[PDB]
Design a protein around this ligand. Structure first.
Ligand SMILES: O=P(O)(O)O[C@H]1O[C@H](CO)[C@@H](O)[C@H]1O
Ligand SMILES: O=P(O)(O)O[C@H]1O[C@H](CO)[C@@H](O)[C@H]1O
Ligand SMILES: O=P(O)(O)O[C@H]1O[C@H](CO)[C@@H](O)[C@H]1O
Ligand SMILES: O=P(O)(O)O[C@H]1O[C@H](CO)[C@@H](O)[C@H]1O
Ligand SMILES: O=P(O)(O)O[C@H]1O[C@H](CO)[C@@H](O)[C@H]1O
Ligand SMILES: O=c1[nH]cc(F)c(=O)[nH]1
Ligand SMILES: O=c1[nH]cc(F)c(=O)[nH]1
Ligand SMILES: O=c1[nH]cc(F)c(=O)[nH]1
Ligand SMILES: O=c1[nH]cc(F)c(=O)[nH]1
Ligand SMILES: O=c1[nH]cc(F)c(=O)[nH]1
Ligand SMILES: [K+]
Ligand SMILES: [K+]
Ligand SMILES: [K+]
Lengths: 250, 246, 250, 246, 250, 250
C-alpha cells in the first residue's frame, strides 16, 4: 500500500483520475457492475475499492463510510494516487414538500454543518460543487429520465440532532439546531445528508473537481425514518445517473 | 413610489422579471443602450435604474452602488417589484497569475468576507450562484469567445484591508486578514470583488436566481491599484446571458 | 487623481483636514451652502465631493453612499489626502418610544452589526466616537436648541432584516436577527442606521477623529417605512448642528 | 430491526447495558472472542456488532467506524436498545516525547476538534469521560501492569490537516490549524485520535457513561520507528475494565 | 516580595507544593486551623494567605476572590512560588432536584462560561480536573461519609444573568443565557459556580494538578437566593473533605 | 442586609445614587477620607463599603475586587440599593511610549477581552462610558492640572497572558493573544486594565451611568511588573480626580 488506510498502490489505479465515492461499502460493487471489467482492489475498514472501465478508461469506485472524517481520508489518499475528479452518490432525506421519495437531487453547494470542512477552509469558504461535474450530473439525470431537483443541501455531522430528529434516546435537540430544519426549509434547502460539505469544500479548496447527487429515501415533512420498501429502487436509480455522469467527465 | 430607495413602481417595470445589476450608476445607461427601446426610469443616491427590452421582453438595469448594504437594498426593492433574476456585471482584480487582464470570470460561489450576507443566512450557508444563471453566463462567454475562468470569488466588505492592500494611510492590515490573499490564492480563489457574497447569499436563501460575471482590470500579483475592450466584453456577455434566461 | 475612487488630488483639498460625510450624494451641495465659497471638486459613483470654507479654513463635504463598504473607501482615500477628522451627518430610525421625529441623536458608540468594521479591528474593539467630536456635536445641538439624545446606536449592513423589518419580499428574518430590535431596545439603543460602526471603528483604530449625528425621520415603535413629509425640517436641523460642530473642531 | 443503521433488535442484546466500541469493524470479532459465548448479530456499513458474555452477563461489541458522525449513529442506536456504558478501545499515536510505544493512554477528557460534539452541546461543554469508567480503566491497566498515562486527548475530524500532517497531496494546512500541534504539546495533550470528542460529549450530555483507553503503536516526535502486542494489551485492559463496570 | 499581588516570597511557603484555594478571604483562617502550626503569611486585596502543616508537610491556604480573573492571579503567582497542586473548595448552587443543600459536589470538568480560561486555551480544550486530585476528593468524601455527587459544573463569569437569575435590578437576561439553565439541567450538569473553568483550564494547560469540590448552599430548581442560617455548616462539610484530600496528594 | 454579597441595606446608603468603585478594598478608606463624614458600612469578601458626604449629599465608596465577575456583583447589588452612577478608579499599565508613569487615563470605551460583559450584551455592543461621566472626569483632570490622555482601553480577564506578559511560570502566551499587545498599540489603545469592559458594558446596557479613570503605574514598552517605588505618588492623583468628578455629577 502507498497510503495509510485504503490499501492501494498507484499501480492498482492503472492511470485512473476519476473516482465514484458512495457512502456505503456494499454499494461499491453495484456501481462497478454497471461498468466493464469490474475488479475488487481492496477492503479495509469502511473503505472498499473496486476498479472498472468506462468507454475504455479506468475508473475507481471507493466507499467513504458515513461522515466527513472518513470521507476526508478517502479523498486525500485517492488524490495522492492520482484521482482528480470525485462524484459522490448518496442517499438523502428531502425537507421540501414537493420533493418525493425516488427523486434525484444534484447539489450545487452545501450548508456546512460539519467539522471536517473547517480543517481545509474557514466557514466563509463556499462548499461549492465543480461546474462541469454538476453539469454532468444534471445532463445525466435528464438523459435517463429521473425527476430531478437542483439546489443547496444541508450537510450534517449527525443523523439525529443535526437533522432535527426528535424520535431518539433523549427526545431533545440542542439549542443551536432547534428550529433549524424549518429555517433551511424557508431558505430553499432541498435535503439533508452527511458527507457533501466535507467533500465539496476539500476539493474546491485544493483544485480537485467534485460533484454530488443523492437519491431521496425519505421526506421529513412526512416521517423521520425511511421506509425499507422503496430504498433499493431509489439507490439503483441514482447509481445509474452517477455512472452516466462519470462518462461525460472522462 | 412603491419602494423606499429606488424611486420606482411595479408599473414602471412593465412586467420585467430580470434585472442586470452593475455597481456603477454611470454604467447603467451603457448597458441598457445595447438593448431595445432604452428608457431612464429613476436615479436616487447610488441607484440609477433604466428599462429596456431584450427579444421583446422588458428588462431592468439598476445600479447597486459599492458594497453589500446598498446591494441588499436594491435587490430587496426590485424583488418587491417582481424581479426574480439578478445578473451582476462587475469589474475585478484577479489574484491568480494565469488569469490575464482582459479575461472574464464567472463566479460559481463566493467566500463571504462581508456582513450583509449574515443578515439572510448564517455563515455556513453557501453564497452560491444559481445554476441556470451560471450556465447561461458560461455559454454566453463561449458565444463571444472570451477566455473564461469559472470558480470561486472572494467578496470583501473593504477595498483595502479585506483585499490585503498595504499601500494605505495606516499601512497595516488587521491580524484576521494578514496573509489572507496567499491563503485564498492557494485555495484556488480567482479574484476579489465586493458585492457577490451578499447578492448570491440573499438570492439563494429567498428563491431568487442570481449569477455573477466580471471583467478583469488588474492582476494583483503585479500591482495593487488598477484595453477597456474588456468591460465591453463582459457587458456583451451579461446581456447575452440575460437573453437565454428570459 | 491621487486616489482610485474619489477622483481627487491633495491640491484639490487646499490643506483641508476636516470632512463632513453625509450618505446621500444629493445632500453634499446642500451642506456646502451653509459655508463660504462652495465649489464642486468631483463626482464619481456615489462619491460627490465639494469644498467650502469655515472661519477661513478649507473643509470637505463628501458623500459615502449607503453602507460601510463604500464608507470605508471614502474615509481611507480622504485620509490619504490629509483628512484627520470625519463628521457623519445622517438620517435614522429611532427604536425608543420617547425619541420623536425631528429629534437629533448624537452617537457615543455603535453596535457593530456590519462587516467592514471587522476589517480594521476585531469585534471586541469598541466602535466609539472621538471624545472631542462628540463634545462639539452635543454642544452644537444645545446651542441651536434642538431636542437631543446621546447614546448608543445600532449600525446594520442591511436596511431590512438587520433592522428587523418584516414588510419585505420574503416576510421573514434570519434566526440571528429575530427578536433583535426588542433586545437592543431593552439595552437602551436609540436607533438604527447603516454606516457608523464602520466609520467609528476604522477611525478609532487608526488615529483619526470621528463623530456621528443624525436627524430622526421615523419611529419604529409605530412604523417601518418613514413618512414622506418630515424628511425636510429634520434633515436641515441636523445639517446645521454638524456645520456648527465642524466650526468648533477646526 | 428496531434501529435504522445497526440492524439490531432489543432482543438481540439479551439485556446488555455495556458496549465495547472499537473503530474497525474487522476487530469486533477478535475482542468478542476474548469473552464467553461470542455470537455475531449483524453487519451493515461500518457497524459490525457481536454479543458476548462476561462473568455470566451479556456484553456488546460494536464498531463505530472512523469519525464522530458514524460514532454518533452507533452510540445513539445502541442507547435506544438499552446500552448505558460505552468503553472506547483503540490504538493511537502520541505527540509527547516521554510517551513510548507499548504504553496505554486513558483519556480523562478531549479537545473538541470535531463537528459532531457540537450537535449535542455547545463548545464550552467539556468532552469529559465518566469518572467510574475512567477509574475502572486505570485500575485495569495497573492490574495487568501496563505503563500508563492519564490525560487529555485531542480529537480531530481529520487524520491529516487536523493533526497538522504536511506529508499530503496539498502539503499545506489551513490557518486555524497551523501551529496547533505545538500548542497541544505545550498544553500536555498526549495524543490525537478521531472519535472521543463526539463519544464523550454525547454521553456526558445525555446521562450515559463513557471511557476510553488506547495502545500507543506510533509516536510523531520519536525516531527511529517501531514497528499486535500493543493492540491486544489495550484490549485486555478494556475487557477487564468492563468486568468492573457490570 | 517575589510576586506582585499576593505579597509573598518563596521562603514564606517553606517548600510547600500544595495550596487549598477557597474563594472567600475570611474562610482561609478557618481552613488553616484544621491543620497544624497555622501561621498568617499575608493579606492584600482579596488574597489572604496562611501557611500550615499537614502530616508534617507545609501547606498553603490562599483565597482567590470571586471570579476567574483574580483566581488566575493567585494560581499564577503561587505557581511561580512553587505550588504544583491546587484544590479549590467553594460554595455552589445546585440545579438538579436530587441534590441537597449541605451536599458535596466534586467537579470532573466544567462548562466554560468564563473569559479567563480562554486566555490559557481555546474553548475546545476541556476544563477537566486532574484525575489524582478528583480521586482523592471522592475517597476523602467517602471516608467521612458525606453525601456526594460527582459530575460536570457550569462555571459562570457572573452570579446573576450567567446563572439565569431574574430577580435583579433589570429583571432580564441577555438572549445567549435565556433558557440556559434548562439546557444545562437536561445535560446532567450538577451546579453553578464561578471559578472552576478558569482554575481547571489554566492548570491542565500548564501541567499543574487541580481539583474542585464545593458545598451546596441553594437549590436553583426551587429558589434563586441562598438562605442565611444554614451556610455555616455546609462550609464545614466540604472543608473537612478538601483538607483530607490534601493529605492523600502530599 | 437586602443583598446577598455586599452586606448592605437601603438605609445604609441614605439616598445615595452615586458610587465610586475602586478595585482594592484597602483603597476605599483612602478615598472616603477625601470627603466629609466618612464611615465604614461593611466588609465582606473583597467588597468593602464606606459612605461619605460630598457637598451635602451622601456618596458610596465600594471595592469591586479584581475582575469583571466580582465587579458585576458589586454593581448589580449596588444598583438594587439605588446607585445609578458608577465611577471606577483603578491602576493601569500604559502600552504607548508617550504615556508615562504618573499619568491619568480616561477611558471612552474598552476592548472586551473579558467574559462578564457577554453575560449582559453580545460582543458587538460597545463597552462605552457614559458621556456625562467621561466629560466630568476629563474636566476634573483639567481643573487640577494632571497630564491626561483620553481614549480606548483594553480590558482583560487576566493580568498575565491576556496582557501578553511572558515573565511567568510557563513563559508562553496562548495563540489568540500572541502579538496582541503590539496590535492594540498600533490601533491607538492606551492601556490595559481588568474591570472596565464589564463595568461599562453592564451599565450602558441597563440605563446606569458609568465612568472610568486610572493612574498609570507601569509602562509596558519598558517593563512587565510595576515598580512599587512610584505607585503611591500616582494613586493619590487619580483618587483626587474621581472625587472631583463625582462632585460634578451629584
Ligand atoms: O447512503 P450514503 O451514501 O451513506 O448517504 C447518506 O446516508 C448516510 C446516513 O444514513 C450518510 O452517509 C448520508 O450522507
Ligand atoms: O465595477 P463594480 O460592479 O462596482 O465592481 C467592483 O469594483 C468596486 C471597487 O473598485 C467594487 O464595487 C467591486 O465589486
Ligand atoms: O441618510 P444617510 O446619511 O445615508 O443615513 C442613513 O439612511 C440610509 C438608509 O435610508 C443609510 O445610509 C442610513 O445609515
Ligand atoms: O464561596 P466561594 O468559595 O467564593 O464560591 C462561590 O460563590 C461565590 C459567589 O457567591 C463565587 O465565588 C462562587 O464560585
Ligand atoms: O488597582 P485596581 O483598581 O484594582 O485596578 C487594576 O489593577 C488590577 C491588577 O493589578 C486590576 O484590578 C486592574 O484593572
Ligand atoms: O443523512 C441522511 N441520509 C439519508 C437520509 F434518508 C436522511 O434523511 N439523512
Ligand atoms: O474589489 C475590487 N474591485 C475592482 C478591482 F480592480 C479590485 O482589485 N478589487
Ligand atoms: O438606516 C436607516 N435609515 C433611515 C431610517 F429611517 C431607518 O429606519 N434606518
Ligand atoms: O456561584 C454561585 N455560588 C453560590 C451559589 F449558591 C450559586 O448559586 N452560585
Ligand atoms: O491590569 C493591570 N493593572 C495594573 C497594571 F500596572 C497593569 O499593567 N495591568
Ligand atoms: K454604497
Ligand atoms: K465513518
Ligand atoms: K475578585
Amino acid at each position: 500500500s502507498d497510503v495509510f488506510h485504503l490499501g492501494l498502490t498507484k499501480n492498482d489505479l492503472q492511470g485512473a483520475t476519476l473516482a465514484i465515492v458512495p457512502g456505503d461499502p456494499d454499494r461499491v460493487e453495484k456501481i462497478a457492475a454497471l461498468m466493464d471489467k469490474p475488479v475488487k482492489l481492496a477492503s479495509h475498514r469502511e473503505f472498499t475499492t473496486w476498479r472498472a472501465e468506462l468507454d475504455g478508461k479506468p475508473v475507481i469506485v471507493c466507499s467513504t463510510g458515513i461522515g466527513g472524517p472518513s470521507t476526508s481520508i478517502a479523498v486525500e489518499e485517492l488524490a495522492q494516487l492520482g484521482i482528480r475528479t470525485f462524484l459522490r452518490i448518496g442517499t438523502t432525506g428531502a425537507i421540501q414538500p414537493h420533493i418525493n421519495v425516488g427523486d434525484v437531487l444534484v447539489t450545487t453547494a452545501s450548508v456546512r454543518l460539519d467539522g471536517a470542512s473547517l480543517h481545509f477552509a474557514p466557514l466563509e469558504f463556499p462548499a461549492v460543487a465543480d461546474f462541469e461535474c454538476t453539469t454532468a450530473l444534471v445532463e445525466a439525470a435528464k438523459s435517463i429520465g429521473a425527476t430531478t431537483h437542483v439546489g443547496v443541501t444541508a450537510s450534517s455531522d449527525t443523523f439525529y440532532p443535526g437533522q432535527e430528529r426528535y424520535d431518539t434516546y433523549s427526545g431533545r435537540v440542542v439549542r443551536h439546531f432547534k428550529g433549524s430544519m424549518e429555517e433551511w426549509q424557508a431558505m430553499g434547502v432541498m435535503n439533508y445528508e452527511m458527507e457533501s460539505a466535507t467533500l465539496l469544500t476539500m476539493c474546491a479548496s485544493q483544485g480537485l473537481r467534485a460533484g454530488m447527487v443523492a437519491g431521496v429515501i425519505v421526506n421529513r415533512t412526512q416521517q423521520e425514518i425511511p421506509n425499507a420498501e422503496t430504498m433499493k429502487q431509489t439507490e439503483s436509480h441514482a447509481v445509474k445517473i452517477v455512472v452516466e455522469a462519470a462518462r461525460r467527465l472522462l
